[PDB]
Amino acid sequence: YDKWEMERTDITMKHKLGGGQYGEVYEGVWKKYSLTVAVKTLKEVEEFLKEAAVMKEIKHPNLVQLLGVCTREPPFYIITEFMTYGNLLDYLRECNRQEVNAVVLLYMATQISSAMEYLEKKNFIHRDLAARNCLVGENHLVKVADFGLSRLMTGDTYTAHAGAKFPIKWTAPESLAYNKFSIKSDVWAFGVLLWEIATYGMSPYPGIDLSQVYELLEKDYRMERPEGCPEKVYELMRACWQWNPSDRPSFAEIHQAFETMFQES
Numbered sequence: 219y220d221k222w223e224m225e226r227t228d229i230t231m232k233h234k235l236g237g238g239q240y241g242e243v244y245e246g247v248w249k250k251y252s253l254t255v256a257v258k259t260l261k262e263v264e265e266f267l268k269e270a271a272v273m274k275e276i277k278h279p280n281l282v283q284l285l286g287v288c289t290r291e292p293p294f295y296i297i298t299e300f301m302t303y304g305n306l307l308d309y310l311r312e313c314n315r316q317e318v319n320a321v322v323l324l325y326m327a328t329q330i331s332s333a334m335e336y337l338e339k340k341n342f343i344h345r346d347l348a349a350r351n352c353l354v355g356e357n358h359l360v361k362v363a364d365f366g367l368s369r370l371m372t373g374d375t376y377t378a379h380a381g382a383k384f385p386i387k388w389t390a391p392e393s394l395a396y397n398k399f400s401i402k403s404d405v406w407a408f409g410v411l412l413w414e415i416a417t418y419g420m421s422p423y424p425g426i427d428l429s430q431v432y433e434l435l436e437k438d439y440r441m442e443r444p445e446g447c448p449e450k451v452y453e454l455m456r457a458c459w460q461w462n463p464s465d466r467p468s469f470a471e472i473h474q475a476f477e478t479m480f481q482e483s
């Protein structure tokens with residue numbers, strides 16, 4: 219047992235988080251610090267433990283933070299911080315837009331690009347970047363997470379493809395075509411995430427059937443600039459959606475771009 223192991227009794231387990239929305243994830247309390255936490259449990263063990271191992275290597279203010287694990291006897295736990303306002307997609311859809319205004323949106327985008335710049339530097343790939351996988355805390359804190367939603371979400375967000383489950387409208391073309399994932403396919407998804415933010419959580423390619431998406435992209439179709447979107451933000455989206463992965467900017471470049479816009483605003 220390493221430095222991450224914590225005693226089961228350190229955590230008060232409360233109810234399942236969001237009525238199964240997240241699978242076997244529970245809201246808990248880290249008693250000694252009076253902090254609310256999220257606790258993922260295991261009803262497969264290999265994948266579970268591999269996740270914990272990845273998380274031990276990630277430390278950034280805009281990434282969900284591992285706090286501990288319980289691995290001595292079942293059920294095993296992965297414990298992370300809990301974020302006050304929950305997932306970004308629902309947050310955007312339900313917020314007061316005078317309060318969560320343009321400067322807040324720029325701040326959120328900046329934080330997300332910072333997280334991704336970090337994963338980029340560490341040679342990690344996210345593979346499912348989207349507003350549904352981000353969390354919002356007080357004072358507009360935003361953290362990137364990965365909830366493993368493809369196997370929990372009901373509806374058309376994820377649909378079968380290449381014998382797997384893909385969120386087609388967030389998926390880079392090369393990932394769709396040749397099942398190739400890289401930090402540049404995350405950059406593509408980040409562009410879609412910008413559009414989610416810009417529209418306060420609309421579904422992308424609205425009114426366009428999933429069946430048409432890949433062909434449209436292949437023939438150079440791209441979502442148009444959302445109402446109220448600054449040209450500079452839209453330029454970033456278009457750069458993220460370059461057909462060729464090597465033509466897309468790095469997260470380092472994206473973050474620098476947003477840093478500048480945020481401070482200017």
Ligand SMILES: Cc1ccc(NC(=O)c2ccc(CN3CCN(C)CC3)cc2)cc1Nc1nccc(-c2cccnc2)n1
Pocket residue numbers: 235240243256257258269272273282296297298299300301302303304305342343344345353362363364365
């Ligand atoms: C309890 C838990 C356990 C594991 C994780 N895991 C991650 O969030 C995560 C993030 C990044 C990576 C990095 N990884 C690199 C490799 N690629 C392929 C995948 C991504 C992995 C896991 C989160 C949580 N936290 C969590 N889970 C579900 C819901 C909530 C939650 C809900 C509402 C409010 N606050 C929190 N919180």
Ligand SMILES: O=C1NC(=O)[C@@H](c2cn(-c3ccccc3)nc2-c2ccc(F)cc2)N1
Pocket residue numbers: 320321323324327411412413415416417444445446447448451483
């Ligand atoms: O009504 C709106 N339309 C939008 O696109 C959004 C918006 C407005 N500004 C803005 C910024 C500065 C001045 C005026 C407007 N910046 C954004 C934005 C969109 C996506 C993103 F990731 C981050 C920010 N608000």
